[PDB]
Amino acid sequence: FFKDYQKKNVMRLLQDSLEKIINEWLKTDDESHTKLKSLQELSEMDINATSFAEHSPLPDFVTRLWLDPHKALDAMDKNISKNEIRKLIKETAREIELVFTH
Amino acid sequence: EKTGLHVHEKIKHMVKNYGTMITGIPAEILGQNEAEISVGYVKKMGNMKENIAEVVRKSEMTQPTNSCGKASNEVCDLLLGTEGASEFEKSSYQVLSGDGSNLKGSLPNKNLLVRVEMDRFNAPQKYQKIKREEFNPETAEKNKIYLLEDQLVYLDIFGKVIDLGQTSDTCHRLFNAITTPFYQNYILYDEYIDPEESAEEAAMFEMGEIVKAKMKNIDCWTATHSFTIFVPESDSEDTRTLYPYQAYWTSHTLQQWFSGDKDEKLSRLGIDGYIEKLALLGTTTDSKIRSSIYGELFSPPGKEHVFCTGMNEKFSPLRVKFKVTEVNPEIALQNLEEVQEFIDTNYPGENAKDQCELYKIKAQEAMTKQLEMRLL
């Protein structure tokens, strides 16, 4: 039980961190909506593609957390697979993009 | 024994003593996360090492969450296990009837946990008169009435445009009637407006009548508070008491709830009495009654008379949604045991406070480290 409970709560903390960082980086977008189009691109990027993150409009935290999560947060539990992290980043990006197409 | 009352005492004892440690989040990954979201806050001028330490100390990471839902999610997970709490969360709510009878009936004498959602009827209170070629529903302030030249729309809180069923000719007349700049962007229900004063004010009263009438069949309620109620099995019908658990967004933590014995205070109301007040919250039309009871039930301990006063008066109508499921005390107590074991194993101390100080120190040292990696 505890490892599931602990893991769920750590994911939501990483999801909390990604929400705050992206929402503040997105508050300063230009009238061409450049950051929103890029955020849209992350939501659909393949779970195995590691090249779009070559320096992009996205904030430092996201690019690094995607490419190698256990280096960007080297206290993160081994029982959180890298793909779980990448899927979380994609899901987070999708949820904020949908808010700002309406 | 493994009585359901022991489940209550264990979760209260543990959230009181350990606070945010109940999440099970390891201190190190806590500080690395809080470093990432704080990079921008660190001064770039001077003795960065002191500037890092300043942000680490001003950091409220080891304070427990004060979020209505997050606390309730936490109580469900511990009391029902990780998948029992998903089944309970996915199932349907139920609106508290006017007399609360439907909740009273949902409480057989067993170890039961109730989850409650407080909804507010957040209906629009303001309006703007705007020309069509200047109205953009994605840019405009949500939850507002908009009077275009030929249409009267409601832009709801989700960005949806709802037409209010007016003819072009009714709208053109109201659009051309409201000429005063003070009233171009105003409120919908100014009780001091006298329509007989001018055509303009007459148009304002009319529009107010249209929007009030149409807003009744537009049931956009909004979730405003979340809490749980543990109702342990009791020896007899009268010994039966309930214990509400809550945090309040931006106001207080569940740890502070237990530090003030507010569960115990509210538990002393009885079940009939608690359901009476919870129900009156949803039937009353007196805002002083509504505000006073919301304070009693939901204020931080010791603020029952300051919670909903002045600008915090509860003017919007409220409703209560609930759902009830059974608690397995042996399962809850072992879930609680496993959190206790993890706290002891990784943050040991002679007393609970020393365990809490060791956690915070571990998290600040992770934070200090992660911030130095980004400002190397």
Author numbering:
A (entry chain A): 11 to 112
B (entry chain B): 7 to 382
Copied sentences from the primary study:
Strikingly, the SidE- and MavC-type enzymes, two recently identified effector families from the bacterial pathogen Legionella pneumophila, can ubiquitinate host substrates through non-canonical mechanisms without engaging any of the conventional ubiquitination machinery. The genomic cluster of MavC encodes three effector proteins: Lpg2147 (MavC itself), Lpg2148 (MavC paralog A, or MvcA), and Lpg2149. Taken together, our data show that MavC can catalyze deamidation, ubiquitination, and deubiquitination by using the same active pocket. In addition to MavC and MvcA, the same genomic cluster in L. pneumophila also encodes a small effector protein, Lpg2149, which has been shown to interact with both enzymes and inhibit their deamidation activities.
The inhibitory role of Lpg2149 in the MavC system is reminiscent of the function of SidJ in the SidE system, although their operation mechanisms are distinct from each other. To understand the detailed molecular mechanisms of Lpg2149-mediated inhibition, we determined the crystal structures of MavC–Lpg2149 and MvcA–Lpg2149 complexes (X-ray statistics in Table 1). The asymmetric unit contains one Lpg2149 and one enzyme for both structures, highlighting a 1:1 molar ratio of the complex formation. Both structures adopt a similar assembly, with the Lpg2149 monomer binding to the connecting region between Catalytic and HBD domains. Lpg2149 forms similar and extensive hydrogen bonding and hydrophobic interactions with MavC and MvcA, which are mainly mediated by the N-terminal α-helix (aa 11–37) and a helix-loop motif (aa 74–86) of Lpg2149. Structural superimposition of MavC in Ub- and Lpg2149-bound states shows that Lpg2149 and Ub occupy a similar binding position and form severe steric clashes with each other, indicating that Lpg2149 can interfere with the interactions between Ub and MavC/MvcA. Upon binding to the enzymes, this C-terminal α-helix folds back and occupies the groove of the very same Lpg2149 molecule. The Catalytic–HBD dual domain of MavC adopts a similar conformation with or without Lpg2149. Given that MavC has the pre-formed Lpg2149 binding surface, we anticipated that MavC may have a stronger binding affinity to Lpg2149 than MvcA. Isothermal titration calorimetry (ITC) experiments confirm that the binding of Lpg2149–MavC (~0.57 nM) is ~50-fold stronger than that of Lpg2149–MvcA (~28.08 nM). Further SEC experiments show that the V20D/L23D/L24D mutant cannot form a stable complex with MavC like WT Lpg2149.
